[PDB]
Amino acid sequence: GVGVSTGSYDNQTHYRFLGDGWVEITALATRLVHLNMPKSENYCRIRVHN
Amino acid sequence: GVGVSTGSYDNQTHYRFLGDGWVEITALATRLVHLNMPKSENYCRIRVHN
């Protein structure tokens, strides 16, 4: 299953007009996210005093 | 038949929205007109040289 896209890119905005001036707006957004390894594989309780 | 109005006054503007963003606009206008006696009861051929 590798070597094949699994989605579509779309960042458009569509307006649909119904009667009585109501309007359905459809906002579409796509972004490319970059993820890094976690600093630590642990949960940390951290205190912060300035 | 005298002493009774024969019309309605209306100077509004209405917008009707159909699908696909088409719009029907209905412009309504009323005015009170003043009419004076004709200067002459005749048809006149008039020349104008400046």
Side-chain angles (χ1 to χ4, degrees), chain B:
Chain B
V2 47
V4 302
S5 297
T6 49
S8 171
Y9 182 82
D10 202 326
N11 214 275
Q12 301 181 354
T13 298
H14 303 117
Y15 298 79
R16 268 231 300 155
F17 303 79
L18 316 327
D20 296 8
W22 284 100
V23 188
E24 165 177 290
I25 308 177
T26 313
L28 275 183
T30 314
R31 292 288 134 80
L32 164 46
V33 177
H34 173 116
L35 190 55
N36 263 119
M37 217 159 58
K39 257 292 184 178
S40 171
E41 304 291 303
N42 296 57
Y43 278 99
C44 310
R45 178 163 54 97
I46 295 175
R47 202 176 67 278
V48 161
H49 205 165
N50 64 320

Side-chain angles (χ1 to χ4, degrees), chain A residues 3-49:
Chain A
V4 302
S5 297
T6 49
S8 171
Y9 182 82
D10 202 326
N11 214 275
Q12 301 181 354
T13 298
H14 303 117
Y15 298 79
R16 268 231 300 155
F17 303 79
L18 316 327
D20 296 8
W22 284 100
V23 188
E24 165 177 290
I25 308 177
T26 313
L28 275 183
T30 314
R31 292 288 134 80
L32 164 46
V33 177
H34 173 116
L35 190 55
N36 263 119
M37 217 159 58
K39 257 292 184 178
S40 171
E41 304 291 303
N42 296 57
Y43 278 99
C44 310
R45 178 163 54 97
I46 295 175
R47 202 176 67 278
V48 161
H49 205 165

